[PDB]
Write a protein that binds this ligand. Structure first.
Ligand SMILES: *[C@@H](O)[C@H](C[C@@H]1CCNC1=O)NC(=O)[C@H](CC(C)C)NC(=O)OCC(C)(C)Oc1ccc(F)cc1
Lengths: 300, 298
């Protein structure tokens, strides 16, 4: 198994650059609106505790330089929605895909199109950690790069990049501008919650192992969801939700292994360790493949 | 540190579907030519010992169905170049990027756009193994998916997918239709030569781990180039050349760790192991990042 990103072309066709003064970051051009992080209006002096509302009142449409490549897009309105700026432009993007804005849950994966100056540089798969950070590869100038999933013709945008935390992990918002996690767009001291292991994804991984014939860890027992959750927390695993149980449905049906029976197998692995054994050729349990990722690869 | 693929849009706009009889795979549509694996012209009974020139002379332009989305492209000509079929169509692709065809060297990396029925499905980074296989993720119908690198505006196509081996690794050709490795496009179980580990890439990745503040594997020892290479060969690592040392200069400068010092750290890891420890998340030494890959992402 490997991290596989979605093809990025439908998102590449939406990337632009947005500049205020000397600050350039990326924006997302859909129909006649460009979405970008509101901290584009900050000077270095405003970043420690910006008054975004006061900073925005000082701005006019003609202060925003929006470019697709070297071609300027004229701004005809502006507004702030939580931590994102929305710039109305006079041209509808002809490459606008079918799209929606979604707010994902921890554990869910998405593709990131890393961009600098409106130009895409790379694409890679990210997992939203339970502490609402991602382990991106984001340099200066990457803000406004987005994360997405593609289903049929439809791009679901779920992430827009805003900042790096002291530990090197990354934080951002959904496309309505609401941060994931307890972070704020100020250049202040912020730390992530201690991270935990994404249980639903480990279970997906165990299902993948079973599909591929590697099933030594299956046992004759079961558990309740509550009993499993109380044990899992003692090993720094996330508790399962009802939604987690539901999204394991398809893999449970494909293997005939009830979700709670797999939980009992995982509980035994946590309590007894691997005893020098491997699963899918690894003594480490993987937690960045979702149930959908596993189906995406195993079955095509 | 993240494996990062090139943005795939310039290649997505070239993918089409090619069908012959009951066989469907992907093709690459550049200007007015579609490139695809020639085994699309095979049936079940053909796959075992296909005399491709014989099978092809018995085909007409009209036996080839090419679809770009919902639109059928009329084939007005065909030819074979090694293991690739070239179908001339009456329409030019306006989305054809600036491109070239290159043959890559073992140890080099590229992005794969995996496709099914002419539709892009996923993108990921691969390395050409020293034994000329690739560790891909390819399923039924993935043939004709391509691998590529992008430099500025220019797409360098280096790989077209043809087959899976019994071990689960993959084999294919350059865009001139010559296989990488000793493989043949017949429906037989084929083994590769013994694989080895790409040493210059492991060193690049260790330098990456250091840059990201991870240096538990470092040491004060050093080694000569020849003595390192003796140990490498013993562990089925590829030789490290002076060109490789030179190529690693920038990473050496940035971290202030001489290449041969990092060679001494790798030698220790080979002889002793990781003793449970991990490097950049991995229990294993990673060898599919090139020096250029590490830099580009730093
Ligand atoms: C694309 O047409 C397809 C891609 C394969 C399918 C699954 N994963 C892939 O990468 N190519 C082939 O199926 C290829 C066609 C030949 C004409 C070159 N053959 C192939 O990949 O065979 C797979 C294999 C596992 C080797 O199956 C076996 C065939 C014969 C045997 F004796 C034993 C196994």
């Amino acid at each position: 198994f490997r991290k596989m990103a979605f093809p990025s072309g439908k998102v590449e066709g939406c990337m632009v650059q947005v500049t205020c003064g000397t600050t350039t970051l990326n924006g997302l051009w859909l129909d006649d609106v460009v979405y970008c992080p509101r901290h584009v209006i900050c000077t270095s002096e405003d970043m420690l505790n910006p008054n975004y509302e006061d900073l925005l009142i000082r701005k006019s449409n003609h202060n925003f330089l929006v470019q697709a490549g070297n071609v300027q897009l004229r701004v005809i309105g502006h507004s702030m929605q939580n931590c994102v700026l929305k710039l109305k432009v006079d041209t509808a993007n002809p490459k606008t895909p079918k799209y929606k804005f979604v707010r994902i849950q921890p554990g869910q994966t998405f593709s990131v199109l890393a961009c600098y100056n409106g130009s895409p540089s790379g694409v890679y798969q990210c997992a939203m950690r339970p502490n609402f950070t991602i382990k991106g590869s984001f340099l200066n100038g990457s803000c406004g790069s987005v994360g997405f999933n593609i289903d049929y013709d439809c791009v679901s945008f779920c992430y827009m990049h805003h900042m790096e935390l002291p530990t090197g992990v990354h934080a951002g918002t959904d496309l309505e501008g609401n941060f994931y996690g307890p972070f704020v767009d100020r250049q202040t001291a912020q730390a992530a919650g201690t991270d935990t292991t994404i249980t639903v994804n480990v279970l997906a991984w165990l299902y993948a192992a079973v599909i591929n014939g590697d099933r030594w860890f299956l046992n004759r027992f079961t558990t309740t969801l509550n009993d499993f959750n109380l044990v899992a927390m003692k090993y720094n695993y996330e508790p399962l939700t009802q939604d987690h149980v539901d999204i394991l449905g398809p893999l449970s049906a494909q293997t005939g292994i009830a979700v709670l029976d797999m939980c009992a197998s995982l509980k035994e692995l946590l309590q007894n360790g691997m005893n020098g054994r491997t699963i899918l050729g690894s003594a480490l349990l993987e937690d960045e493949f979702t149930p959908f990722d596993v189906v995406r690869q195993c079955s095509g």
